[PDB]
Design a protein around this ligand. Structure first.
Ligand SMILES: CCCCCCCC/C=C/CCCCCCCC(=O)OC[C@H](COP(=O)(O)OCCN)OC(=O)CCCCCCC/C=C/CCCCCCCC
Ligand SMILES: CCCCCCCC/C=C\CCCCCCCC(=O)OC[C@H](COP(=O)(O)OCCN)OC(=O)CCCCCCC/C=C/CCCCCCCC
Ligand SMILES: CCCCCCCC/C=C\CCCCCCCC(=O)OC[C@H](COP(=O)(O)OCCN)OC(=O)CCCCCCC/C=C/CCCCCCCC
Lengths: 309, 319, 318, 300, 316, 316
């Protein structure tokens, strides 16, 4: 189960990435339009006014339009949606980066399988009733399974460090995106002074142009900037929650406070990290899984099984 | 999928209204990209920054190129067309996306989503269980069916202990309702205020005399009446959405959804031991009552210790 | 999926007519969005704001720019072309969406959707029950007898649940009434305004200060096409009217809230099948309209004589 | 669909002809919507409202672009033949009515219920293990078959609806061929329009070129060919429903081949759909014979 | 679907080739709809009803835009070759005929019924565990399904050997495909050179325009030549596949299948030498996978039925 | 579909890369079909077939709109490079050929049958209830019959597939073709990507129809068709690198010999032989995807597990 190991901030970032992809696709379809920039030459040769004849054909106007689109419009105003698509693709790929690793996937699947089968175990409810037959043998087998999990997962710390790496990658990518987008968002202007030297072709040298979708691209850039800022705030909170409490150390003393048996130990490394995942999801899962960690609880279960047999 | 039981008639109504509103947003958006322009004609005689408006008739010669006309159209469309006429479909799309996010936030938020999927799964599988019909009819039972019945009883008990502790689902549904109704109020206020600025005839004065020769132009916005009727239809849809939202708020606040009394089911059957469920469990059971009281009636038989006593006795007989 | 049993011939016909109307609605909407325009040429000689209509021939020099022509087209399309000719496909789309909403509010409203799903499940379970064959014959396995008894109890519980109140019948009656009155209004205003879709329009918008001419003659190229999309649409509505009217007659020629099993209780030996009423009666009448065999083999689960026969048969097998 | 066997070769062949007719109708419809127009040019010189044609230099007409568009629209509306303008819509309507005639035998709830009952019992007999034992030499299934026979021999509504559908599908073919053949010569590339817009344009008569006429020609010819095929198929269908009586089916060959000779001669709607079964594959009918003979019921 | 088992490598190759030619037909038709115009400029100096072809300033033709459009339409209709105008429509029609000829095997009700029955019995023989158990050399449900399946196989074998309708239909389909391949290659190879970028039109519209001869450029002519070369290559590949299929049918009698190697490998050495249509569909099975015929052949020998009935007698 | 198991990480990576290349091919083709042209303006001053380039007012060329269109069409046909014109069609064809090379493994009927049968038995063994008990080391009649039939089918399928290697040979050929085509694509695209220029000097000699000899043209989509091409090249490089790694994965170890020493040593069933050829190849592919499938299947081929299964069946 890969949905359960995803906290609220991860789903929020996934939906923000989906919205950013939609913005990029809309910008690309905006760039599909043929009519992009409209240019007019400068210094052309009850008050009644008369029009200024520029003595230019339609083809000369089209040539001026394309020359000023290529050599006067800023590269950001032309290739913003493609950059948005690339950035949102990299953001989406790195969202499940700690999910797709082989060992990470194996330990996550083992944890969710063990936790789910513990959740439908009658003896968990039996031990909760004790705190506040055949199923005894199943509980003994599940205790050996929990010990196997402790030997199989706790020796490593790949998951927490790899999650920290993915979150740091998200934070730095948000920083770079915000930086260059704030630096280049002022380049998307309506009126552009185009100064291409096509005087030998059209007769004029200075042109004043307008980018027709400059306002729409500016609004799209500001919306993308707001989305990236929300993404960065979410990732900054993720970094704060990751680093303010040591996820290499899960204190089960909160279980010890209301539950009388004190034998359950303080798990370390990957076990503590994934238990913090499940605590962010639902703390009842951890408070129930706590009772399967003790050894004197196993001895009491063995005593009950000996009485039954 | 299986969440339809948790969506009452108001939620379905807002779901379909949001779908139609998104269709409106898409239609207005594609028209705005495609055929949104302003055909601008200069005023030959001006008087104090305004058009003067002073043997066969002959056309007025403006001596303007086609591209000077396009430049004038783009400049006046950018500068003097009201922002509402330019950004109505995108504002509608943003509002509908936020409405859909508010209506589907509790389905995606893990803390409430876990409780919701647990409730839906165990309630549906209790509804199709055979021992529910066996108990409500008041023999021999199959081994597999007996194991399913005892497992379902234990799961219902553990879920009842798991859910009644807090009221996260009730609080989230409440907050979604107030957010939706205040956003409806804001949407209707600003849309009604700014809906009259979508005009066919727009007088622009953009100071491009150095490039064209004329200063004031009289532009025609072709998609102004179509955008006006689209905005009126959007306002009507938002009005319906908001009225449904205040009905949902009144339904939430009139009674106490955090307290369920099973007096209807418990008096009807012989089981007088069914407890008065409270908190979040009571809230989603009230939602199911808004869908169908039969689901709650068939689920209440799993909350009584008399029923589990009879099940245990029959299972001991079978074993 | 399994709702096809609850759709009689009139419902299927109205669904197909609504689909065709939606097709012509999106067709006209595409035309109106993409090539809807108005070619307006000024009348050089005029008399009291009216078109006077008065060596090889030479073209009339109007001395108008292309953009002046575009402005004249836009103004006389906005001001003088009738609103019906401009917004007919949108009206057709809105009416088709309203008709579809009225047709599917039966299945989308949760209070009646739950009852409809329960009735469909119970009816299909009784349809596939082997004991019904024996019930229509006049040995079963333990599983067959057990499931027959369980579905007998389920049928009894469902009859207690649904027969208490009529919400399905009331909603169906209201939907038919709303569809009939919508057809009446649609036919009235469409027939009244279909004569304004004309190819030739004389426009007089007073833009002499911007163009130089007062009155113009305009050709609306799509108008004739819209005409063959309008009258045709009217015919469809007429069908959608008459069929719906028949449905209304079917809801008024007899009380659908009283289903009589007289034919079955006379043909079959079981004479104890009660005269079911209310929503149960209404859905049984709908199923009778679909296929009488479903109701015929469902009627054996409403009689206690068949229950006693099943109990005795199960005891004989035991 | 569920009636994969009740449709013989003529039914499926006409269905595919209808599909190809529908796609060419849609192609012609988008053709007429998107770029269908006509380019109209006046005759400058005149001799009794004509043009005389008394290096080379182009002829000036003193017409604006909008005057040309007005002439195009007016001549397209007035002097282009209505067939050349509404051929794809006529084809689309004809194919929609053809598909409605084909699927009304499927959509009517009484006939749909009867067909689904026969299909369900036929398939459950086809997958039944006892028919193999009978052919080598289910009681509730036999009683169901007898009850279905008593239910379905009461009326022949399915055969009557099939007959009516065949008559509509052949007379519509006749009308389509007559009118399309008569009017296919009105799709000309070069037309003459005399629309009397001299007060707005200055010219009276114009020569117009219809760019999509020739395509609309050959497609129409193509359409005619397809219709002919349809009609020919329908023609033989009429023969198939007039040479033999489909309301009475004889099981003589199967009951002679099989050990049981007590299979009665089936009548009515049962006979008609068993004739359809024999047209598709005789195995289904041969197999359903042994689920009908009362001698095999006594053996069952 | 269920007919995937009956289609050998040539059939699936032709299907993918045909869908590719449909893709190029759709592309060509869309481009012929959208940008199949031509740009015609009048020849200023006419010499013997032709073009003399005899700082700089542009040539003034005194023609409106609408006269240019009229000249374009008239010369596109009259003096452009019919191949350059109807290449995508002809390609679509040919591909549709190829699809119809390839799928008429599955749509003719007699042959479709035979093929569906063959597929059903082969698949249920694949699902049968007793078929594997017998080849390896008793459950009640296994015995019932087994007895039903051998009786099914005997009934099918008696049914299908009556007529070789399916083999003759496949022969006719291959012959139609190869002759249509020959005709397509002949006329397309002849007429592909007529797609030219530069054409000269002489349409006699001097009464309306003032010029007699015009020089026209067809912008889509080179793209249409590329598409025609692609179509010719695809049809050449399809035709070579058809040659191999016809040679496969004519190499050995497909109406005569011997199980000699199969019954020599297995303990059962009395599997009969089937013939006609059953032999044909079994040859197609061998073309797809010899394992299907390998596991199906045990249902035809009398020794296998004798031991099946002996084991049923032991069970009963 | 069912063949998701047989696709390792390199295969799904190339699938996503091919999907992205098809996406950019569709985008480039849409741009090429819709708005690919060039704006050509005549050069008033000509010197040695080139432009001299020796308030302000415009230059009057005295050319109609249709003369401009004719000049644009002729200089797009004759002087713009073929790579700039046909880059979207080339990337579309290359992506189609790469997808065909990827899926010819799945579509070839012999290898399709082998892969489908392998995947079917592997999925029914992976979900077999007997595997959990065997790994944990009475039997239900239905479950025992299913286990016995599954064991016999695994044995006979191993004998059926061990005879020859056709799946490995096709995979080898597909990887070789995919790397050779990658090399050719990179070479020719890198060589011809420099011909996509925004400014093109055209000289087409239409002075008789236009009046000018040399024109200067702007190709509006050139720069875009530059960067997309670069992007395309980047994707191809990635594709090639992945293919190169796959080629190395074919050569560093013998893919036709599989040893169960990773399972037979750990498990008590040390009697597992070394499978060979195609069976070894698909088992190595499973190990590339997930070793759990091969580990759970490995108990169904050893004979000690067969002995213990027969003992459990006898105990019932
Ligand atoms: C906010 C999200 C919005 C999502 C946007 C989706 C993608 C948008 C990008 C579009 C991609 C390519 C389409 C561009 C076509 C532009 C052609 C263009 O502008 O040419 C100008 C010219 C101006 O048109 P007139 O004839 O004056 O029309 C005036 C109407 N009386 O237009 C043309 O020549 C043809 C226009 C092409 C239309 C293309 C779009 C049509 C969309 C179909 C609408 C579907 C209707 C649905 C049902 C309607 C209600 C029943
Ligand atoms: C592998 C090859 C596959 C080829 C498939 C191509 C599909 C399209 C084929 C049909 C072509 C139709 C031609 C339409 C031309 C109509 C007249 C014309 O020239 O239109 C120009 C007009 C100018 O824009 P206006 O809206 O007027 O701008 C100013 C007002 N805002 O519109 C256009 O730009 C083109 C008109 C529509 C053509 C394109 C239609 C399909 C476009 C698909 C968009 C692809 C976007 C992909 C999104 C993600 C990208 C990473
Ligand atoms: C019953 C059918 C219902 C569906 C109909 C839906 C209508 C189409 C929806 C898309 C709206 C876009 C249409 C825009 C039209 C106005 C734009 C305009 O001014 O175009 C000018 C210009 C007119 O001249 P040309 O075509 O160059 O003439 C050359 C002479 N041979 O037209 C264009 O450029 C094309 C305009 C856009 C066309 C896009 C839609 C065409 C659809 C193609 C249908 C066939 C597709 C598959 C082909 C099958 C193989 C044969």
């Amino acid at each position: 189960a890969f949905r359960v190991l995803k906290p609220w901030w991860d789903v929020f970032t996934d939906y923000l990435s989906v919205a950013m992809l939609m913005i990029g696709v809309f910008g690309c379809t905006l760039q599909v339009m043929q009519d992009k920039i409209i240019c007019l030459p400068k210094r052309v040769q009850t008050v009644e006014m008369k029009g200024l004849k520029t003595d230019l054909d339609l083809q000369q106007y089209s040539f001026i339009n394309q020359m000023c689109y290529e050599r006067a419009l800023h590269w950001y105003a032309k290739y913003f949606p493609y950059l948005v698509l690339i950035h949102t693709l990299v953001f989406m790929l790195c969202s499940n980066f700690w999910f797709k690793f082989p060992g990470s996937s194996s330990k996550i699947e083992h944890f969710i399988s063990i936790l789910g089968k513990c959740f439908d175990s009658p003896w968990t409810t039996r031990a909760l009733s004790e705190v506040s037959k055949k199923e005894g043998e199943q509980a003994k087998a599940l205790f050996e399974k929990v010990k196997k999990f402790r030997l199989h997962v706790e020796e490593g710390d790949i998951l927490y460090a790899m999650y920290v790496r993915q979150t740091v990658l998200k934070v730095i990518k948000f920083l770079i995106i915000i930086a260059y987008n704030s630096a280049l968002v002022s380049k998307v202007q309506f009126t552009v002074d185009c100064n291409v030297d096509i005087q030998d072709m059209t007769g004029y040298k200075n042109f004043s142009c307008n980018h027709t979708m400059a306002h729409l691209f500016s609004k799209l850039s500001f919306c993308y900037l707001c989305f990236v800022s929300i993404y960065g705030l979410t990732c900054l909170y993720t970094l704060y929650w990751l680093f303010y409490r040591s996820l290499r150390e899960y204190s089960f003393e909160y279980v010890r406070q209301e539950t009388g048996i004190d034998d359950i130990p303080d798990v370390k490394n990957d076990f503590a990290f994934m238990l913090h995942m499940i605590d962010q999801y639902d703390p009842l899962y951890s408070k129930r899984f706590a009772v399967f960690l003790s050894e004197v609880s196993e001895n009491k279960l063995k005593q009950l099984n000996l009485n039954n047999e | 999928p299986a969440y339809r039981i948790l969506k009452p008639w108001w939620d379905v109504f807002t779901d379909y209204i949001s779908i139609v509103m998104l269709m409106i947003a898409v239609f207005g958006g594609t028209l705005q990209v495609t055929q949104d322009k302003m055909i601008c004609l200069p005023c030959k005689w001006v008087t104090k920054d305004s058009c003067n408006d002073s043997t066969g008739p002959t056309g007025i010669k403006y001596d303007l190129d086609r591209h000077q006309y396009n430049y004038v159209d783009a400049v006046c469309y950018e500068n003097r067309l009201h922002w509402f006429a330019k950004y109505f479909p995108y504002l509608v799309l943003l509002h509908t996306l936020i409405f859909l996010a508010c209506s589907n936030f509790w389905f995606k938020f893990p803390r409430t989503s876990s409780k919701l999927e647990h409730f839906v799964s165990i309630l549906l599988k209790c509804f199709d269980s055979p021992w529910t019909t066996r108990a409500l009819s008041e023999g021999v039972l199959d081994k597999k069916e007996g194991e399913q019945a005892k497992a379902l009883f234990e799961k219902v008990k553990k879920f009842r202990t798991h859910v009644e502790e807090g009221d996260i689902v009730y609080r989230l549904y409440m907050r979604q309702t107030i957010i939706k109704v205040i956003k409806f109020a804001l949407i209707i206020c600003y849309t009604v205020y700014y809906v009259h600025n979508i005009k066919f005839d727009v007088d622009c004065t953009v100071d491009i005399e150095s490039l064209t020769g004329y200063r004031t132009y009289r532009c025609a916005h072709p998609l102004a009446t179509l955008f006006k009727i689209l905005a009126s239809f959007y306002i009507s849809l938002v009005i319906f959405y908001g009225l449904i939202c205040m009905y949902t708020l009144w339904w939430m606040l009139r009674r106490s959804l955090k307290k369920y009394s099973f007096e209807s089911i418990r008096e009807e059957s012989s089981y007088s031991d069914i407890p008065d469920v409270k908190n979040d469990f009571a809230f989603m059971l009230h939602l199911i009552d808004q869908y169908d009281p039969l689901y709650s009636k068939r689920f209440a038989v799993f909350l009584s210790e008399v029923s589990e006593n009879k099940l245990r006795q029959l299972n001991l007989n079978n074993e």
